[PDB]
Amino acid sequence: VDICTAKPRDIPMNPMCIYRSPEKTNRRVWELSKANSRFATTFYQHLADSKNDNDNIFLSPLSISTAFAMTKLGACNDTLQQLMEVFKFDTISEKTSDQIHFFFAKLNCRLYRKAAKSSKLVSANRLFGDKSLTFNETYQDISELVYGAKLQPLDFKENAEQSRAAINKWVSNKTEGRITDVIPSAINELTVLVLVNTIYFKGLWKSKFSPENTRKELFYKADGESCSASMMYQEGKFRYRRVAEGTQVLELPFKGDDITMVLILPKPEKSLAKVEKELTPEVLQEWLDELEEMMLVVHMPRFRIEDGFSLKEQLQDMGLVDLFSPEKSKLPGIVAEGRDDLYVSDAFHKAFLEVNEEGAEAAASTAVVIAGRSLNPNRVTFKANRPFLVFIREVPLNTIIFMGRVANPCV
Numbered sequence: 445v446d447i448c449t450a451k452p453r454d455i456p457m458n459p460m461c462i463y464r465s466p467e468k469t470n471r472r473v474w475e476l477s478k479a480n481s482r483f484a485t486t487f488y489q490h491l492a493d494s495k496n497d498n499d500n501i502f503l504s505p506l507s508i509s510t511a512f513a514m515t516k517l518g519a520c521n522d523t524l525q526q527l528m529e530v531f532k533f534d535t536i537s538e539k540t541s542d543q544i545h546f547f548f549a550k551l552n553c554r555l556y557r558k559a560a561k562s563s564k565l566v567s568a569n570r571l572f573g574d575k576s577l578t579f580n581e582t583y584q585d586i587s588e589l590v591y592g593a594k595l596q597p598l599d600f601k602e603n604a605e606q607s608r609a610a611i612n613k614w615v616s617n618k619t620e621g622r623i624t625d626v627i628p629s630a631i632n633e634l635t636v637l638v639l640v641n642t643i644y645f646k647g648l649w650k651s652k653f654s655p656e657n658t659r660k661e662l663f664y665k666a667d668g669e670s671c672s673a674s675m676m677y678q679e680g681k682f683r684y685r686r687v688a689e690g691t692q693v694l695e696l697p698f699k700g701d702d703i704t705m706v707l708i709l710p711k712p713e714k715s716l717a718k719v720e721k722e723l724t725p726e727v728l729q730e731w732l733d734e735l736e737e738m739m740l741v742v743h744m745p746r747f748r749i750e751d752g753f754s755l756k757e758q759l760q761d762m763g764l765v766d767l768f769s770p771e772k773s774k775l776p777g778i779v780a781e782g783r784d785d786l787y788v789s790d791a792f793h794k795a796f797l798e799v800n801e802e803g804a805e806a807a808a809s810t811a812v813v814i815a816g817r818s819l820n821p822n823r824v825t826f827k828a829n830r831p832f833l834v835f836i837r838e839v840p841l842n843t844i845i846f847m848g849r850v851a852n853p854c855v
């Protein structure tokens with residue numbers, strides 16, 4: 445059987461570890477994407493909340509949700525329940541926890557098909573365990589089929605540091621060397637399980653900027669003072685909409701039109717922080733529906749953002765506790781001889797974004813010529829010269845792939 449042809453019954457459901465969540469316009473939006481977008485917002489609001497307004501933030505919530513959905517496969521009892529609760533999977537109307545995997549199956553088949561296009565989307569979620577660990581036979585099948593992940597054994601007990609390098613080597617190798625340190629220089633003999641996940645993305649703007657127009661304008665940091673940023677410039681039709689409290693929403697599609705960058709730029713008078721605190725799937729979904737094609741002037745800066753962290757802490761502060769507890773963790777999916785206390789040592793994540801005139805960490809140079817164009821002098825301008833939010837969504841799937849805050853694109 446194939447990941448894109450796997451029917452629902454191919455995702456075995458054992459009674460010993462099943463959860464049951466109590467009950468509670470336009471095209472069709474998958475239930476799973478909604479559940480993911482809820483975690484994305486929820487999680488982001490936290491991360492931001494604990495970060496200074498002048499810091500850049502960037503992560504892939506889809507990646508995190510995927511790594512743990514793949515992990516909850518071997519979970520059970522309170523471990524399994526908590527995972528469902530934190531990762532909003534239980535908001536899914538009233539289906540069983542095993543069906544969630546059938547969804548990710550259908551979602552991952554769409555996001556990572558080989559049918560090449562201009563924008564490439566590579567996933568890297570793997571679970572690293574010590575050699576002595578034997579991932580259950582059936583747990584393996586699914587983890588691989590549905591999440592294309594392995595349960596790669598390593599030696600943390602004897603010669604840990606050599607395996608930590610093995611890890612960073614793999615990720616680096618899957619992110620085309622753009623992420624070479626997912627595991628900070630955090631591993632030892634007292635390390636049983638390690639979950640690593642990231643998403644690599646590269647794309648070309650469906651509507652490129654001309655480096656010929658990139659001058660150094662001024663970016664106004666949240667602390668009041670300013671600094672210099674490489675400001676890209678262009679004019680054209682874009683899905684746009686100035687929403688509540690004067691906040692501009694801008695969709696910049698990558699070639700292909702199925703993956704787009706959605707920028708949220710609040711008015712000078714409003715603090716990005718006040719908008720981050722108002723984000724919710726419902727509110728985001730509403731803005732995206734109001735976006736209307738339109739000619740306008742775009743002023744977005746060139747920026748590079750490489751954010752990376754250890755999820756364990758924040759996740760626990762969010763309700764994910766057992767999974768990380770040597771005594772509470774219930775992982776019937778993983779097994780070791782004479783070791784009945786399998787827990788997750790940690791979970792690491794790292795996202796990277798390079799944005800210039802070409803697109804997502806693309807770097808060719810494209811010049812542009814426009815003959816005989818005249819725009820209504822009274823045209824809208826989107827000058828992102830103050831902190832703004834960023835989203836990399838997968839439109840046909842209404843899935844939030846990446847999200848961050850460019851609070852300082854200054855050299």
Ligand SMILES: *[C@@H]1O[C@H](CO)[C@@H](O[C@@H]2O[C@H](CO)[C@@H](O[C@H]3O[C@H](CO)[C@@H](O)[C@H](O)[C@@H]3O)[C@H](O)[C@H]2NC(C)=O)[C@H](O)[C@H]1NC(C)=O
Binds near residue numbers: 461
């Ligand atoms: C974790 O969750 C498991 C299921 O959710 C749970 O297993 C449950 O265990 C009890 C008793 O051990 C079972 O109830 C009956 O089990 C046998 C039937 O083979 C009877 O002989 C006993 O008298 C008992 O009444 C449940 O059927 C079984 N699962 C269900 C359906 O609830 C584990 O005990 C839980 N504990 C942990 C932390 O792993």
Ligand SMILES: *[C@@H]1O[C@H](CO)[C@@H](O[C@@H]2O[C@H](CO)[C@@H](O)[C@H](O)[C@H]2NC(C)=O)[C@H](O)[C@H]1NC(C)=O
Binds near residue numbers: 617618
């Ligand atoms: C990870 O490293 C391996 C080599 O150690 C790469 O595998 C080969 O990559 C070349 C292109 O660089 C392909 O032509 C081969 O088909 C690959 N062989 C295998 C094992 O399938 C691999 O590309 C690196 N990372 C990636 C992109 O997966």
Ligand SMILES: *[C@@H]1O[C@H](CO)[C@@H](O)[C@H](O)[C@H]1NC(C)=O
Binds near residue numbers: 458582
């Ligand atoms: C894997 O373990 C589960 C319980 O965790 C069990 O139901 C299943 O039969 C095992 N898979 C195999 C065939 O090894």
